[PDB]
Design a binder for this molecule. Sequence first.
Ligand SMILES: *[C@@H]1O[C@H](CO)[C@@H](O[C@@H]2O[C@H](CO)[C@@H](O[C@@H]3O[C@H](CO[C@H]4O[C@H](CO)[C@@H](O)[C@H](O[C@H]5O[C@H](CO)[C@@H](O)[C@H](O)[C@@H]5O)[C@@H]4O)[C@@H](O)[C@H](O[C@H]4O[C@H](CO)[C@@H](O)[C@H](O)[C@@H]4O[C@H]4O[C@H](CO)[C@@H](O)[C@H](O)[C@@H]4O)[C@@H]3O)[C@H](O)[C@H]2NC(C)=O)[C@H](O)[C@H]1NC(C)=O
Ligand SMILES: *[C@@H]1O[C@H](CO)[C@@H](O[C@@H]2O[C@H](CO)[C@@H](O[C@@H]3O[C@H](CO[C@H]4O[C@H](CO)[C@@H](O)[C@H](O)[C@@H]4O)[C@@H](O)[C@H](O[C@H]4O[C@H](CO)[C@@H](O)[C@H](O)[C@@H]4O)[C@@H]3O)[C@H](O)[C@H]2NC(C)=O)[C@H](O)[C@H]1NC(C)=O
Ligand SMILES: *[C@@H]1O[C@H](CO)[C@@H](O[C@@H]2O[C@H](CO)[C@@H](O[C@@H]3O[C@H](CO[C@H]4O[C@H](CO)[C@@H](O)[C@H](O)[C@@H]4O)[C@@H](O)[C@H](O[C@H]4O[C@H](CO)[C@@H](O)[C@H](O)[C@@H]4O)[C@@H]3O)[C@H](O)[C@H]2NC(C)=O)[C@H](O)[C@H]1NC(C)=O
Ligand SMILES: *[C@@H]1O[C@H](CO)[C@@H](O[C@@H]2O[C@H](CO)[C@@H](O[C@@H]3O[C@H](CO[C@H]4O[C@H](CO)[C@@H](O)[C@H](O)[C@@H]4O)[C@@H](O)[C@H](O[C@H]4O[C@H](CO)[C@@H](O)[C@H](O)[C@@H]4O)[C@@H]3O)[C@H](O)[C@H]2NC(C)=O)[C@H](O)[C@H]1NC(C)=O
Ligand SMILES: *[C@@H]1O[C@H](CO)[C@@H](O[C@@H]2O[C@H](CO)[C@@H](O[C@@H]3O[C@H](CO[C@H]4O[C@H](CO)[C@@H](O)[C@H](O)[C@@H]4O)[C@@H](O)[C@H](O[C@H]4O[C@H](CO)[C@@H](O)[C@H](O)[C@@H]4O)[C@@H]3O)[C@H](O)[C@H]2NC(C)=O)[C@H](O)[C@H]1NC(C)=O
Ligand SMILES: *[C@@H]1O[C@H](CO)[C@@H](O[C@@H]2O[C@H](CO)[C@@H](O[C@@H]3O[C@H](CO)[C@@H](O)[C@H](O)[C@@H]3O)[C@H](O)[C@H]2NC(C)=O)[C@H](O)[C@H]1NC(C)=O
Ligand SMILES: *[C@@H]1O[C@H](CO)[C@@H](O)[C@H](O)[C@H]1NC(C)=O
Lengths: 105, 227, 234, 333, 130, 117, 118
Amino acid sequence: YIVMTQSPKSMSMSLGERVTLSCRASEYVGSYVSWYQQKPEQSPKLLIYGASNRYTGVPDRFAGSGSATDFTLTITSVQAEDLADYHCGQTYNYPTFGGGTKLEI
Amino acid sequence: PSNMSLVKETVDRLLKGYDIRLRPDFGGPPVAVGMNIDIASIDMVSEVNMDYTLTMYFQQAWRDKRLSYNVIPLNLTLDNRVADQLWVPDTYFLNDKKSFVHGVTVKNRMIRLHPDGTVLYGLRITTTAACMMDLRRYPLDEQNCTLEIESYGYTTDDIEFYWRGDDNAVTGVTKIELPQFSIVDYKLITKKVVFSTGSYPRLSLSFKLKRNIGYFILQTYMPSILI
Amino acid sequence: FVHGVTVKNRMIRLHPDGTVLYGLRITTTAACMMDLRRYPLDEQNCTLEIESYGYTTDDIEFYWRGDDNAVTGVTKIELPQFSIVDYKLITKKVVFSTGSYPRLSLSFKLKRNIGYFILQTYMPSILITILSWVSFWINYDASAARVALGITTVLTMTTINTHLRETLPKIPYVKAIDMYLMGCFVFVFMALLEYALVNYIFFGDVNAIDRWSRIFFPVVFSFFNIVYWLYYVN
Amino acid sequence: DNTTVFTRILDRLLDGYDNRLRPGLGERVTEVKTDIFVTSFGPVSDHDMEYTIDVFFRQSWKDERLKFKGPMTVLRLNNLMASKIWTPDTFFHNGKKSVAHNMTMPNKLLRITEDGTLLYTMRLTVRAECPMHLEDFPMDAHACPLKFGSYAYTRAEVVYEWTREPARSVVVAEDGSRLNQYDLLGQTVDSGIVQSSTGEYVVMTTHFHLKRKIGYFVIQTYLPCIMTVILSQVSFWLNRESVPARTVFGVTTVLTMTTLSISARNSLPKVAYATAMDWFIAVCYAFVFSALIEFATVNYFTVSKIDRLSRIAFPLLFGIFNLVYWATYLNRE
Amino acid sequence: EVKTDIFVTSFGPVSDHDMEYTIDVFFRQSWKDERLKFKGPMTVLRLNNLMASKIWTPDTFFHNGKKSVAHNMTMPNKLLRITEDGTLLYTMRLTVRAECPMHLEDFPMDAHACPLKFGSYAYTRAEVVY
Amino acid sequence: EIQLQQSGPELVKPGTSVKVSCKASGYSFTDYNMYWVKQSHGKSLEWIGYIDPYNADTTYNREFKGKATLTVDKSSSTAFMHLNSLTSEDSAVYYCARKRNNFYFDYWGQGTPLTVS
Amino acid sequence: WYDRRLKFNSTIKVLRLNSNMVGKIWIPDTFFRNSKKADAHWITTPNRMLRIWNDGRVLYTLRLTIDAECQLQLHNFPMDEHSCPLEFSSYGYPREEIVYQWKRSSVEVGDTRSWRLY
Ligand SMILES: *[C@@H]1O[C@H](CO)[C@@H](O[C@@H]2O[C@H](CO)[C@@H](O[C@@H]3O[C@H](CO[C@H]4O[C@H](CO)[C@@H](O)[C@H](O[C@H]5O[C@H](CO)[C@@H](O)[C@H](O)[C@@H]5O)[C@@H]4O)[C@@H](O)[C@H](O[C@H]4O[C@H](CO)[C@@H](O)[C@H](O)[C@@H]4O[C@H]4O[C@H](CO)[C@@H](O)[C@H](O)[C@@H]4O)[C@@H]3O)[C@H](O)[C@H]2NC(C)=O)[C@H](O)[C@H]1NC(C)=O
Ligand SMILES: *[C@@H]1O[C@H](CO)[C@@H](O[C@@H]2O[C@H](CO)[C@@H](O[C@@H]3O[C@H](CO[C@H]4O[C@H](CO)[C@@H](O)[C@H](O)[C@@H]4O)[C@@H](O)[C@H](O[C@H]4O[C@H](CO)[C@@H](O)[C@H](O)[C@@H]4O)[C@@H]3O)[C@H](O)[C@H]2NC(C)=O)[C@H](O)[C@H]1NC(C)=O
Ligand SMILES: *[C@@H]1O[C@H](CO)[C@@H](O[C@@H]2O[C@H](CO)[C@@H](O[C@@H]3O[C@H](CO[C@H]4O[C@H](CO)[C@@H](O)[C@H](O)[C@@H]4O)[C@@H](O)[C@H](O[C@H]4O[C@H](CO)[C@@H](O)[C@H](O)[C@@H]4O)[C@@H]3O)[C@H](O)[C@H]2NC(C)=O)[C@H](O)[C@H]1NC(C)=O
Ligand SMILES: *[C@@H]1O[C@H](CO)[C@@H](O[C@@H]2O[C@H](CO)[C@@H](O[C@@H]3O[C@H](CO[C@H]4O[C@H](CO)[C@@H](O)[C@H](O)[C@@H]4O)[C@@H](O)[C@H](O[C@H]4O[C@H](CO)[C@@H](O)[C@H](O)[C@@H]4O)[C@@H]3O)[C@H](O)[C@H]2NC(C)=O)[C@H](O)[C@H]1NC(C)=O
Ligand SMILES: *[C@@H]1O[C@H](CO)[C@@H](O[C@@H]2O[C@H](CO)[C@@H](O[C@@H]3O[C@H](CO[C@H]4O[C@H](CO)[C@@H](O)[C@H](O)[C@@H]4O)[C@@H](O)[C@H](O[C@H]4O[C@H](CO)[C@@H](O)[C@H](O)[C@@H]4O)[C@@H]3O)[C@H](O)[C@H]2NC(C)=O)[C@H](O)[C@H]1NC(C)=O
Ligand SMILES: *[C@@H]1O[C@H](CO)[C@@H](O[C@@H]2O[C@H](CO)[C@@H](O[C@@H]3O[C@H](CO)[C@@H](O)[C@H](O)[C@@H]3O)[C@H](O)[C@H]2NC(C)=O)[C@H](O)[C@H]1NC(C)=O
Ligand SMILES: *[C@@H]1O[C@H](CO)[C@@H](O)[C@H](O)[C@H]1NC(C)=O
């Protein structure tokens, strides 16, 4: 299967600060990568789909980017409610997800 | 199914009592038939046969009050098979040696009845248009090849052509990369050709092709000068 | 396409029992994967693959009415460059993802007609090779003619090859033809190099070099020819 | 009695169906699951920059109007009926010419499950357009695409998706490789929007990764050129006092390269930039011509003092060029 | 009586090898017809290509034609105007590849009077005269 | 409002098979195939297998081929996951998702903790 | 070919018709047994005629361009006289149902001077 190498284990960025993440893929995955947000004791929540396109009902702060084999998620100004575990995923093949990534102040 | 059933009623109303034999606003002012083109590719510039093969998306929008609808707020895009049941401009390419509409999966046509009445007819036509090639200075030569567009039957009183968007009507020529020809510039013209019968409407899209000397300098001149 | 002149070539014949004899006059440019690695000494095998499209073996079933007589008129065919050594008819039931579909695979085991190409292609190259051998006879004291005679032969080879390449495809393997042409090219080139070596040594014993080269070239070329023919004939 | 039920179902299917409108117009997008089974990757015509491909183009779309209930779970519709229902107007954005094979009968299969799902497998022979930037030819790789999508329906009307996983939705038959000098290394897929004059459309790209096989060019073109160049060097070895021999050798050596150069260019299109094959041929041409130049220079003086430098230089310089050329182009991806 | 007339849009290339030439022509031809007689506000009634097939037309084939094609892009290139009296005017665009018998004995100075013979196929001299 | 309700937390001794259900709501159940994903505490979530309800076809993960058997009920729009030969290592929370398109997993279940003492 | 059905008694001795009626009436399904590719000319209209008499005679004729196949052996070339055939017969109808019979004035060869028989 395809391995999702989440480079950022975790960050301690302060509130209202630019925060970025990286979701590397070992082999070609086109542009089918998706990002999910998992607050503790809660199921994952979809933020970005199709690499860049943002899911409906999602705050505009999140902004995906990146081509095949290079995927990044950025937030312009992290807010209090926008801290949780971030793990990407790819569906170019049978689904595989990377490790979580937390946000802390 | 209320929405789709209502749309079906609207389309049935439009095609009800629609006479394909009559141009829009018959017994009235000429119908302005805008045109816009997207050159998919230009390839196989046959100097030996004095012609080039053109592949393009040939849109031609015109107003039509009969097809106007107001119940539906969106732009209906009916199946491409409805074109045969609707009037269209009798356009023809004067300098076309042979042309055809691409076949698969279905006949590549488009119909889109806007609420006002505007119809965005479109075709994916491949045509081997012919341009008299003046090869006196070949290979160090330019060619003013063109695609004369003209209405076969109707006169200027009945139909009028014009580029829709003017210089922005033709798109995608910049991306084209012919093997040995650089498309230096393209020009759009509007004319009213005065024939024996009368003043017909005319449009001309001319690409001032320029010969790429790199291959000819590579193979023609270099070995000769060496010898 | 089915031929259309005068009317659409096609038949219907409702026999009394119910058997419907439906027939068409068809021209097909059927595909056939050519393994032109032994070409021209090749035995290209080509097939026609009849199969139902939408019906599985539950609903339809294909068989050759007559075990072998269902195919006729093959023997009288006179291919220009080929001989139909054999034909066979197979009636498989290929299993697809949806289900088992019927299949009839008419096959022709075409054999290349070496009689045509032995004179068309091999004979000129071989003859030019023989001309290369003539160079060694000339002399060693004054061989300014030998250089010219040798160097003309490779030009002849190049012209022959250029005309030959038009008919052939671009398969990367040497095939039976390009390998032979290139080997003959190598032999004539080595003849030129032999002249170069002997001329350099003499102007720098010499008679022995001349005669040893003279005897060596025919025998090693004969070995090359024998090896090539043995390898590709089988 | 089974046929009576079946024929009545077929009769009632088209009742009230208006094929001019896509399913669920004005209510929801008409998603179209898709996949391709390539029977054989046809020849790659580099001269026309195109490749032929024979495919079992399949495509499924949910339609609520074509709902039936009966003993049969799947219906079979003949090609005649397939022209009375809304089939998506899919086309190939780079299809120069394509044939929908119809011998003996139209190679089209339409099936309708009870829920209303449809399957429209059909056989096609697309001669798509592959823009070949032949800069590293012969040692070059080209990812020829097969972009296809709706022609009239914008992204807000029909969306194309792969029925299975994107990796599993394009299948190549095991024996389906009709490339003379190419190797179908693999297939990759993607789906992205395209902006057009009429609107935005979903395009289902499919890059067939090909690498040109180079052996034929090596034996037919490179080997004669290298051998001829070596023959040019040996002209130095011969002598200086024998003017006629040197003259004959040099002139014939120059003569050969003309035919060699002409033969190579006939297959390719007349691209202005040197394709890296004409580059090698031209460098070899300059090398043999320089051999003639050096031969004339030594001839002017009329032992072998002038030519010893050339004797050592030409092999060294030529080896430098050969090694540099092969290392540069072969390593380049 | 079919009153014909030709306006050569372009005199195509002369196929020297095959002894034929291509020619693009606006092949006009009018003929009186009493049945298609109408009185109305407009003297001339332009008709679509569909109606052209439903009314009689002269089957004017080419006596030395070989692989002729009638252009159809976009729609069929042919009009049909019916005047009030009934004087039809049936114009069409063609690319006839007529046959030109060439006697290339006086090559390259050879000059050829390539013909374009055309007449009715099914009607004798007593039923259709051009 | 589409909701992917699940059975709830379960505890059982090792080696005893367990079954967990996934109740969908709102959207047509048969249209979009369901995906079952396992997530150990603080570990990357891993996909088990997906069962296209309409034809009941399944494709299990290689590491779970035979460990989990996926079934579905058409009458009651519920997807059932059954685990066999439970062990301590397999203890985690199991989620059932929906693959709306080829891109993203739209809806996810509440979560079903699994404990193997 | 005679056709008992197509008999009419009137002052008109013959019904001279254009190609429009060719499809309507029965036509012998003749085809050329060695035609690699053939086509009937269509410009301006299908080059076909159909004349019918009172007695039932029909005189269907049309213009054709057959690329017939000739077994051109080149054992002695250029020396090979060839009797190239133009075999044609009904595709489906057996001998018991369709008989083709030459007339004495059957093959009216044209002006050989203008031929492309070079
Ligand atoms: C598989 O697909 C192929 C195409 O991909 C189909 O083949 C096509 O089938 C249609 C339907 O029968 C044919 O249409 C007919 O065309 C007649 C004239 O065709 C000429 O023009 C076309 C271009 O438009 C050329 O391509 C043709 O040349 C090709 O075909 C001939 C054989 O026909 C070959 O020999 C050539 O090599 C080419 O391959 C021709 O030049 C046209 O006259 C005809 O219309 C008459 O008949 C229909 C029958 O229903 C009537 O409805 C209609 O009213 C016309 O009838 C009037 O005229 C006739 C004239 O004889 C009178 O006799 C009547 O009494 C009446 O007055 C029809 O439209 C099409 O030509 C053909 N080929 C193509 C498209 O290339 C296959 O059918 C399909 N299926 C299978 C199993 O193969
Ligand atoms: C069915 O399809 C039609 C056709 O697209 C849609 O309606 C038109 O959509 C286009 C979008 O491509 C609109 O284009 C915009 O028009 C603005 C106003 O145009 C008015 O004035 C012109 C004359 O100049 C009239 O022809 C026109 O009808 C309008 O009355 C322009 O100001 C826009 O330019 C600006 O674009 C962007 C965003 O505004 C700016 O950033 C630029 O700087 C630039 O200033 C643009 O050109 C068009 O107005 C729409 N109306 C029409 C054609 O009447 C329908 O929406 C669609 N139906 C649906 C979706 O249901
Ligand atoms: C030059 O280009 C023009 C472009 O329009 C061509 O004109 C079209 O030609 C096609 C094919 O000849 C025509 O399609 C035909 O339409 C007929 C009428 O359809 C109407 O009526 C039927 C009921 O009779 C309705 O069901 C239908 O919805 C329409 O309202 C059909 O009867 C024809 O059917 C024949 O062909 C099909 C092919 O699948 C067979 O299966 C049938 O059995 C039957 O034989 C056919 O579909 C089209 O209508 C023409 N355009 C217009 C506007 O009428 C010219 O033919 C072309 N000429 C040349 C020389 O290239
Ligand atoms: C390739 O070949 C084609 C052949 O079709 C050339 O197209 C012709 O181009 C010329 C010039 O570009 C056209 O000639 C005239 O161009 C005028 C351009 O308008 C500007 O310039 C005029 C003064 O010249 C200003 O008054 C005006 O405001 C603009 O600033 C048109 O206006 C002309 O039309 C007018 O004059 C004619 C004759 O007097 C009148 O009949 C008109 O009604 C109108 O009043 C005129 O068009 C020519 O028309 C083009 N078409 C042809 C010859 O068919 C291409 O130029 C050539 N090169 C390329 C790169 O394609
Ligand atoms: C040109 O190239 C084509 C390539 O397609 C060759 O075609 C092959 O020809 C061979 C020989 O004729 C075919 O082999 C045949 O296989 C049949 C299927 O075998 C299975 O049979 C049952 C199912 O019916 C299974 O249970 C069983 O396990 C087998 O797996 C056989 O039935 C055929 O007959 C006999 O085969 C062997 C003995 O040879 C025994 O099993 C029996 O005695 C049986 O009666 C036959 O063997 C093959 O299928 C063809 N297709 C291929 C290879 O793709 C052409 O032969 C070649 N041209 C020439 C002239 O040879
Ligand atoms: C083309 O074929 C036709 C017939 O297939 C050939 O014409 C036939 O020639 C024979 C030779 O004499 C005729 O036989 C004689 O006919 C007369 C008059 O009918 C009769 O009185 C005699 O008893 C004898 O039968 C035959 O009649 C004639 N065909 C017809 C229909 O009259 C013709 O020669 C062939 N063309 C060639 C060979 O170039
Ligand atoms: C035509 O009428 C005449 C008598 O008027 C009759 O002798 C002849 O048999 C008729 N022919 C037919 C009906 O074909």
